[PDB]
Amino acid sequence: ANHKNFILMLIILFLMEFARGMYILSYINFLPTVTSIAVAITSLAFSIHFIADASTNFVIGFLLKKFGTKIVLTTGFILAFTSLFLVIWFPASPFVIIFSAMMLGIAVSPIWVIMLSSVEEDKRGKQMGYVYFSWLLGLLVGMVFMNLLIKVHPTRFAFMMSLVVLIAWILYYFVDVKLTNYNTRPVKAQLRQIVDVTKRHLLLFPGILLQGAAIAALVPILPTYATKVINVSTIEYTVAIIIGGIGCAVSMLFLSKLIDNRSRNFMYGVILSGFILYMILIFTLSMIVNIHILWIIALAIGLMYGILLPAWNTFMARFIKSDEQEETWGVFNSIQGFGSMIGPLFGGLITQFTNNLNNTFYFSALIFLVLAVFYGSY
């Protein structure tokens, strides 16, 4: 019932991203202010959350490829709900904080790979658009929600993101599973062999890890760039930065709906075209700016994001080898998240000399992109 279950999974994913209004963007970020928890420990639980996801991705792809289907989503539901249940009773203990971020980081991965390894039809210029839109939506709306909760009381309302996973799991029980565990007679001779043959295959690993290293290398450093955006004005400054965020978000909001409205035949040209386009816009970004220049450049950078991510995913799927999709996707997500963590870690060390070297580092990433795009299109 794949279209009825593409809906269900679309909601389940969204609801699971709502649980990143807990142990990542909002609730972890708040602990030091109200408690004696270290200003750094929340910064560590954040990353041990993301290394947990990025690491667990590729192994879980196989762990569903033959070992199971319904239970691996069920075990993820259990460990996520229980690790979030740890905070509702033990809020300020640092160990529960760093642990549940590790565990909530595990559970999201199976839902992600089963989400993009199955319910999309590979005529999925819209599907991954709906998936990525719902992902961004649940992620940001959860964080805003938990901001609204701490402003009532900080740590009290921790059952709420603890129970969103409960409704997402109850909703999951209505989904027919998106693969069959059947009988895994080749328990290991195929398991290990596929983890080997897929690892050994570089299905454009330079594409994926560098894509993660580029997308994430600027977001932490961008708010410090707000100081250099323009001479501050009483009404035309920070509110203008808010408008730059607004017109950029609408871009990705625009690209929930019309990504398969513009995804037919060869995608190879639009990928490189978006690459050079955000090259030009990053060159136009920090270097020269006016107050309204950011708004159109933000709308353009968001259109590039919301058109590139689904189109890069559909491009991979159009040239991934198939009948191993449960893990063929998990390895991609592992490398993509590991690049997404190495990105900010590399931009912040490249900025040890000057903050403007981050954008020229992105320009060099684009120049190597010009080298590697010639290989994927002939």
- One-character DSSP codes across 222-261: HHHHGGGSS---TTTSHHHHHHHHHHHHHHHHHHHHSSST
Specify whether the backbone of 204 is left (phi greater than 0), alpha (psi in -120 to 50) or beta: left
Q: What is the dihedral of CA 39, 43, 45, 46, to 10 degrees?
A: 150
For the chain, the residue count is: 378
Rounded CA separation 21/14 (Å): 11
Helix (H, G, I), strand (E, B) or coil at 100: helix
Tokens of 61: 């792809």
CB atoms within 10 A of CB 182: 8
Exposed, middle or buried: residue 97 (CB in 10 Å: 0-12, 13-18, 19+)?
Answer: buried
Exposed, middle or buried: residue 44 (CB in 10 Å: 0-12, 13-18, 19+)?
Answer: middle
Question: Cα dist. 349→40, 47, 74 in Å?
Answer: 18, 17, 40
DSSP structural state of residue 263 = -
Rounded CA separation 62/289 (Å): 48
Tokens of 296: 């159109």
Give the residue carrying structure tokens 């719902």: 134
DSSP structural state of residue 26 = T
Q: What is the dihedral of CA 158, 162, 168, 169, to 10 degrees?
A: -170
Count Cβ neighbours within 10 Å for each residue of 328-350 and write b for 16 or more, e otherwise.
bbbbbbbbbbbbbbbbbebbeeb
Exposed, middle or buried: residue 231 (CB in 10 Å: 0-12, 13-18, 19+)?
Answer: exposed
C-beta of residue 327 within 8 angstroms of C-beta of residue 195: yes
Helix (H, G, I), strand (E, B) or coil at 154: coil
Rounded to the nearest angstrom, the gap between the alpha carbon of residue 224 and the centroid of all alpha carbons in its chain is 22
- One-character DSSP codes across 104-158: HHHHHHHHHHHHHTTSS-S--TTHHHHHHHHHHHHHHHHHHHHHHHHTT-SGGGH
Rounded CA separation 270/277 (Å): 10
Give the residue carrying structure tokens 């700016």: 289
Rounded CA separation 3/121 (Å): 10
Residues 6+ apart with CB under 8 A from 85: 162
C-beta of residue 376 within 8 angstroms of C-beta of residue 204: yes
- One-character DSSP codes across 344-369: HHHHHHHTTT-TTHHHHHHHHHHHHH
Rounded CA separation 186/196 (Å): 15
Question: Cα dist. 337→136, 205, 210, 370 in Å?
Answer: 15, 12, 10, 23
C-beta of residue 356 within 8 angstroms of C-beta of residue 221: no
Tell me which residue of 123, 122, 104, 81 sits closest to 26, measured CA to CA: 104
Rounded CA separation 18/23 (Å): 10
In the chain, beta strands by DSSP E: none
Rounded to the nearest angstrom, the gap between the alpha carbon of residue 15 and the centroid of all alpha carbons in its chain is 14
Report phi then psi at 274, rounded to 5.
Answer: -65, -35
Give the residue carrying structure tokens 């929340």: 42
Rounded CA separation 369/365 (Å): 6
Alpha carbons within 13 angstroms on the beta-carbon side of residue 245 total 10
Crossing angle of helices 70-89 and 94-116, rounded to 10°? 150
Rounded CA separation 221/361 (Å): 13
Tokens of 65: 């490829």
Supply angle C-alpha 145, 151, 156, rounded to 5.
85
Tokens of 182: 């059947």
Helix (H, G, I), strand (E, B) or coil at 23: coil
Rounded CA separation 298/302 (Å): 6
Method: X-ray
Rounded CA separation 70/78 (Å): 12
Question: Cα dist. 133→182, 323, 373 in Å?
Answer: 33, 27, 26
Tell me which residue of 55, 56, 82, 42 sits closest to 165, measured CA to CA: 82
C-beta of residue 184 within 8 angstroms of C-beta of residue 63: no
Give the residue carrying structure tokens 């901001």: 147
DSSP structural state of residue 65 = I
Report phi then psi at 310, rounded to 5.
Answer: -60, -35
Cα dihedral 329, 126, 135, 349 sign: positive
Considering only the C-alpha atoms of the chain, give the largest distance between any 2 of them, rounded to a whole number of Å. Answer: 69
C-beta of residue 274 within 8 angstroms of C-beta of residue 307: yes
Rounded CA separation 115/13 (Å): 8
